[PDB]
Design a protein around this ligand. Structure first.
Ligand SMILES: Cc1cc2nc3c(=O)[nH]c(=O)nc-3n(C[C@H](O)[C@H](O)[C@H](O)COP(=O)(O)OP(=O)(O)OC[C@H]3O[C@@H](n4cnc5c(N)ncnc54)[C@H](O)[C@@H]3O)c2cc1C
Ligand SMILES: Cc1cc2nc3c(=O)[nH]c(=O)nc-3n(C[C@H](O)[C@H](O)[C@H](O)COP(=O)(O)OP(=O)(O)OC[C@H]3O[C@@H](n4cnc5c(N)ncnc54)[C@H](O)[C@@H]3O)c2cc1C
Lengths: 474, 472
């Protein structure tokens, strides 16, 4: 029985580790297999998000912002912070210690819940048998009643900019720089590139972001994206749209990138270059030829709306399957799959998954953009409120940005909430909770919002939908 | 001199009522007497001029200084020193107040509200006498009157305001230097906020509180954590300490008070009287206006803020209910809408409370102790910020979220937070409660990761024993 489990989970990222905990909570005998070696030379749980993704990036964003504010936005308060500096090794070490604590915390949760951990590489064979290759190279086979595949993702590689020495790096290396890159190039103006560029720009890097697409943040609401581009450019992110990298050359501890833009061939030289074009699903040695599990043309594991693969009792969740490649999407899929194995008719809502970009100002949204609703032919009413009119934001010395609420013009149902500014993600979550209950704009308007709080900007934007905000002209 | 609506007072109640009435097409006047820093009438009431906004401005500046002094090294951030210039900090606050008070006048002009400068008094038959700043009078004929005269600090005989030594909250927001030893009478929201400002800047702060129980309206678990954290921050909060006398000598003040061990004395450079707030009706009502006051000096109104006189309403701090700015403003909206013919109502059950200490404290709905006293069986779920990845990244892990749900129906009955973004997380809870959320409803929603909001999600899951990120 040592080798028999009700649920075997391959991977311990946000998808897999949450699925494993939930399965154990539901009374299923659960194993979770993980191969990733952390900084101490031992297996570290938590996946991309904890080890080289969400948490490390937010740690560096928060440290670098605190330095930036001390250097550039203290005098208005009367604060004199003389000769303020930030030590990059110490900043990175704080991040490493946070990662170590949280990865240890997952192991603590596994122990408390009775999840059995295996260290090594898992491979799905036919008929729900899972071969585990341990760290010593020895194999064993686990007999699973159900398998949850949660093998995650890795950075996209591009031929013009292969990882090279410590000069051309991906996001993992960008979270490990021990000195500020004097000239930093970033390929890709999506969330990851914008966050990483912001960290290092705050510390003095001169940053160019090369983006092949003509449109900035095309999935975000256009009004939000336009303000974001303006603000981030002013902060020193030299974001170049319609700029397609074709070659790179490393010499003298620098890298020269050749790229094509509207004016032809261009060259620019950097001390470090981050390739942040996107993310790809990981299926390396994951599926035996006889497993029965199929991949789509983009390399994701094919699953249905309940994350079931083509093989009964085999599920796949998170970044290895279709849908938004986000940590909270992966974890909610894990919960849904575990609940369904336990017999519950659990159903995931894919329409209210929020997005957050942890720049400062923060950017977040839920639901549909104005441009999507126009393409769908839905008439809408829009309300906005700027943080420049927020008393709380004035006290905070942080008045950039706005809240936008989009409602159906016929029914008043809120269809999207979009924010750039302080506490964007928390205000968007307020909107998402309302949308879960079918809120109208008038419903939000009729609620008591504490004063003074940043939340009031959502209240006013909801009132503005129907032309009766108090604190701005309508 | 004829108006559909005459509003007395331009604080959060009155100025919002005036704007909403004007938006509804009612010919609206608003009367205000308060003189701001430029020597002219300033709108916005207590909250904008000497209350909410100034206090938050000094709290935010002082916290940024505190974090630089005490919580930068862990990030790798060093400095040769950090100082704060108190006059400059206060001047930033004064400029914010000036901008926002000007903004209300701009809103009045855009909406067509007519302003009068002076003291408004309700006479018989809905006539309003306005005494101008030169003492000359005129009478306005009002179809409807909205009384929004607000509040002022409570004065106590044993600590009368004196020179620059014994002050109320208004004086405490105007210190031009850090007091070396600062005494505060009253450990409520105002006293804790003001004490926090000056403690962060180096004052030795004692807070004398007559009640044995700290923050009795807050949930007991939150209040216990708050007392521990604020004491650690240097607020020497003395419970069961009743002030009986004070004496000023040589620009210092000795306070006599009684505690469990008998009569005590303590000497301070400055003393803040922050025991509470009282409704203002000074010269507000003619003897035959028809409007009645209760025994505590509030104007008596029904649940629609209607007085004993038809067409006369009263809102905000001068009437029953929570003395909070968002309560006053929403009452103003209700009254304006009702004058315009709508059967508008006010929800008194989900008014949140916020204390802008750091960590911030906020809550909505009922406490565990209230529900026990009511005999309502409950399930409780909590989640600590020490287990939040977002909070760890923020270097700010003090506190917790608490969700209380009915044990039979699973309906959320209260949400209580001490920690980062407490007010925003409480607002999430309040929105859910408006829609009748259960704890499981919140648990089934997708919360972005990593965000502080996830602490509310986990606490909601913990109600029914299945949080993912803490043992159940
Ligand atoms: C720099 C960066 C910043 C990000 N910021 C955020 C953010 O703030 N918020 C957000 O929502 N998302 C963010 N993301 C995306 C987020 O990291 C992913 O969406 C999330 O980690 C996906 O979770 P998952 O469990 O599907 O996969 P992963 O987190 O990739 O976990 C997969 C696990 O499977 C292991 N594994 C793979 N194959 C095997 C095998 N055969 N046997 C054993 N183990 C195996 C891997 O070692 C890994 O631990 C960020 C990503 C990056 C790179
Ligand atoms: C230090 C402090 C901090 C505070 N912090 C907060 C907080 O963060 N959040 C919150 O919700 N609440 C806070 N409050 C409470 C908040 O200020 C009040 O709840 C709110 O201002 C009440 O609004 P109101 O319109 O009823 O009265 P007020 O704001 O007091 O306005 C009444 C107006 O009427 C004027 N007036 C009175 N009589 C007349 C008359 N006869 N004729 C003409 N004009 C007249 C007054 O000059 C005044 O401008 C704070 C209060 C203080 C003292």
């Amino acid at each position: 029985m040592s080798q028999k489990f009700d649920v075997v989970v391959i991977g311990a990222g946000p998808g897999g580790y949450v699925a494993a905990i939930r399965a154990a909570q539901l009374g299923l005998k659960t194993a979770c297999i993980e191969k990733y070696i952390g900084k101490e030379g031992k297996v570290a749980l938590g996946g991309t998000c904890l080890n080289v993704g969400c948490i490390p990036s937010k740690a560096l964003l928060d440290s670098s912002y605190k330095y930036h504010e001390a250097k550039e936005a203290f005098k208005v308060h009367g604060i004199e912070a003389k000769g303020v500096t930030i030590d990059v090794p110490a900043m990175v070490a704080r991040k490493a210690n946070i990662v170590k604590n949280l990865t240890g915390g997952i192991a603590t949760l596994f122990k408390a819940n009775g999840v059995t951990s295996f260290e090594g590489h898992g491979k799905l064979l036919a008929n729900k048998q899972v071969e585990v290759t341990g760290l010593d190279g020895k194999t064993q086979v686990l007999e699973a009643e159900n398998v949850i595949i949660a093998s995650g993702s890795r950075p996209v590689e591009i031929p013009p900019a292969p990882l090279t020495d410590d000069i051309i790096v991906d996001s993992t290396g960008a979270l490990e720089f021990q000195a500020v890159p004097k000239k930093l190039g970033v390929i890709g103006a999506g969330v990851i590139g914008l966050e990483l560029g912001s960290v290092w720009a705050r510390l003095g890097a001169e940053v160019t972001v090369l983006e092949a697409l003509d449109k900035f943040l095309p999935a975000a609401d256009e009004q939000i994206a336009k303000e974001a581009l303006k603000v981030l450019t002013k902060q020193g992110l030299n974001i170049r749209l319609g700029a397609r990298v074709t070659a790179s050359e490393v010499k003298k501890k620098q890298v020269t990138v050749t790229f094509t833009d509207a004016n032809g061939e261009q060259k620019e030289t950097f001390d470090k270059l981050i390739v942040a074009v996107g993310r790809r699903p990981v299926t390396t040695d994951l599926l035996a030829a006889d497993s029965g599990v199929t991949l789509d043309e983009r390399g994701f594991i094919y699953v249905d709306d309940h994350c079931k693969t083509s093989v009964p009792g085999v599920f796949a969740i998170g970044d290895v399957v279709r849908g938004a490649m986000l940590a909270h999407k992966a974890s909610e899929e894990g919960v849904m799959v575990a609940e369904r194995i336990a017999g519950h008719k659990a159903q995931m809502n894919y329409d209210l998954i929020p997005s957050v970009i942890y720049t400062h100002p923060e950017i977040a949204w839920v639901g549909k953009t104005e441009q999507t609703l126009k393409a769908e032919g839905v008439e809408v009413n829009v309300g906005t409120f700027p943080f420049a009119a927020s008393g709380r934001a004035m006290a905070a010395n942080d008045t950039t940005g706005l809240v936008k609420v989009i409602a159906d013009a016929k029914t008043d149902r809120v269809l999207g909430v979009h924010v750039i500014g302080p506490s964007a993600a928390e205000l968007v979550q307020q909107g998402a909770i309302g949308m879960e209950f079918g809120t109208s704009a008038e419903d939000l308007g009729m609620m008591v919002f504490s004063h003074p709080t940043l939340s009031e900007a959502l209240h006013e934007a909801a009132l503005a939908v129907n032309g009766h905000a108090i604190h701005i002209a309508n």
